[PDB]
């Protein structure tokens, strides 16, 4: 309808003139909805007006000139307490044939109506003229007919009109007259509401309804002297009169007709927003459970709220779709929820539930928009027009953001059924050129071009006035001139360049792959925000990075699951050590904040530890897992940790720089770090902070298809991924995801033994120093420094010791919990004792694995 | 603000670096142990302030700040309010002059 | 209508939101005053952001300038409607045909780029980048 409204509001100079006049001075006459000053209602613009008679004449003059050209108009006039009379007779026809209703029958009906008026009313005494009009429906639909009777000249009250209307319902003469015309129910022909509803201005109609066409008009002249003399004559030459002005009930300045004195907020939102209208058109496509079920309804209201802040009336209306759930929740919960997903999700759901209605609605929208541009500029198309119609057409598949290099970059949302790389589904991919947007413009857009071609051809076929046909002929000509340009390479490139602005979504790059709880996998996107899910459908999550492994839920009965579990148990038979190692490695898939822990995992070779590390690296992929050179530790490469989740190392007795390790375990550090070797490293430091975050463990079992083939096996990688995510979930449920809380006595003992064997201070503290609550002797930083000096000289090697440096080392060592500030502002030893040569521990002085019957990987209910 | 946010043991010597310290940013250095250089108390050393922390978290022993409260936007807003408030107080009292504020403990430790 | 014409009209129309000044690199740079109700990053409100290309201006010429073109359209159409002397009516019809011939060009990409380049001089505000962010208060 709006397309015809468009066409009719250009080539029809009169329509444009009327709209301009209404907009430029009749807007100052606007009235707020519900005001009684309303007399003219625009059923299109939804605006009500209050016109003075002087400007009312010009308006009626504009309404007459527009009407004669066949324009479709939907005006209404407000009839109130004191106005003219109107009668509606919606005849119900027994047969499809339209009754003739010759002029004599109409004259008889007018006589009968005036008889009823005379009986049931009080009229002024003297000579008066009463004008009658009979507007008839142009064609009888499915045995349904009707006509209107208008009496603008008479002026009575609403009570008088109601009394007259009730009186006519009992008129035997009119009933019998309608009887032979084929009326099923003559008594129900009259509308009792005819005195209440505002009536259509002449020439108007209802939506998808033809206007009532004037059949003939009768003139009646009555006098008080001879009440029984009723002259009736047809009005001659009616077509030369301002029919809209004459037929206006409220108008009092008619040339012929003379005065004989005897909720809106939702509509405003819909009419002021085409996009809201489109949403309403597609919201009815949703299944009934999307407003009664709280999760779906909450998702919908959240999507509306995120879409914009003025969609409240739609949120009210959609929540109001169920009476009981509007009250069992609803009318208050809507306020709460109003106070991540957008229209794309609703759009996809509408496609999923009602695909064919979805398709029809979207194609009609494309046609309407594209034709609105065509109608707006005489069929000449430029780059921005097609850019906007493409954005409206495939705005849910591309996003453009300016990268760090200042160049616009096109991203595609990969859907099943398109050529792609392996592991590239349900994600975003970088494209140097929107190749699919180049093919789509040429192919799929041509369909919308065609639809308008047949639209214009059909309008040419219809019988119109000669100027309309000529104008359509010119419009079509310009259109095929403009049609072939979508195949021109320069035109297409320009359209892409213009569309780079519409498809621009700011902050896509910096919001890309930021979530550590989402992971890109071969079959889709993995989710670990809640325990337990795989996203393998349309979604708004901005995922670009991905790894080629497909993810499956944990299936213990899988042969690869059992094989990998057996290899794991063989490699690390200790329950505590295996559980701790697996929970630590389960964080490798996690790309968020870490606990600042690093491991020096030693081994005797051919123990499978390198196999395990290689398996983890290949499963996580090069995007998330990286190899780190050991040469950095013995000394650009720092940047390799960006966005990763796993790091590893793979000669004899390397020297480890304490500064490199201190800087490593400090963009942010979001990678799990492990050091693997066959020779024990040498650590040249004594600070407790560096050592406490370090671990040492040695592989012992030696093995005497896995190494070269099963690691390449995709099924093995998938099963290992299930294993790894299952340990991560188990660790999160049990210990709130904390790796320090897992008890590993073997690993802890090995780490302590390695630390004592490498650091002299720690072994000195654990051997020659014993905590004693009784012995609180003041081992001042100085004294204890000296005792270490003789300890080192008499146990390891003779060397020159400095009190200051040893005191500083002791400050940050494990003893720091026992050092307290003396009142003399000097560091002293409190609650501790020193063992001298050949000294043993005194009383009260202390030095400073349930194997499951079931499977170890199984859920152990022993917290 | 420029933070020298960490160290290993005693800091290195800094005579040429302090000649450079003698610029629109506040400076601070966060070692656990003493620096290998210092100067005359009215020569280049006049600009050095020293202070050593006393309390220990485990009146010098006390019982989420590092990993949770640090990233809360409301906490950062509150700390910004604290900073602007203290700036206002210093401006109103000492007219923006930092030497006029009496710090006997810092002076003594320095 | 040619590039400088629409450039001047746009400068009058949105001269309160964009500033152009050449940096040390010898290239003109666009700045935009961010207002509430637009897409933006966090904390980018009521502040000037460096734009590689004036996407807002490009869209603005297509949408909001179209309103003024439309208003001139019904203005000249109204003068057509009124009874005038024959030569005047012919003049107005010729001006119309010209108007519509030149009307669609605001959607053309090359025309839009030319208008932007021409307006780069009108929007120029010397010493802006040097005085940018200079106040310590």
Numbering used by the authors:
A (entry chain G): 10 to 271, 287 to 363, 372 to 564, 566 to 668, 678 to 692, 695 to 710, 726 to 763, 779 to 922, ...
B (entry chain M): 688 to 709, 728 to 763, 771 to 775, 779 to 825
C (entry chain M): 413 to 549
Could you pull the original sentences from the published paper?
Here, we report the structural and biochemical studies of the highly conserved C962R protein of ASFV, showing that C962R is a multidomain protein. The N-terminal AEP domain is responsible for the DNA polymerization activity, whereas the DNA unwinding activity is catalyzed by the central SF3 helicase domain. The middle PriCT2 and D5_N domains and the C-terminal Tail domain all contribute to the DNA unwinding activity of C962R. C962R preferentially works on forked DNA, and likely functions in Base-excision repair (BER) or other repair pathway in ASFV.
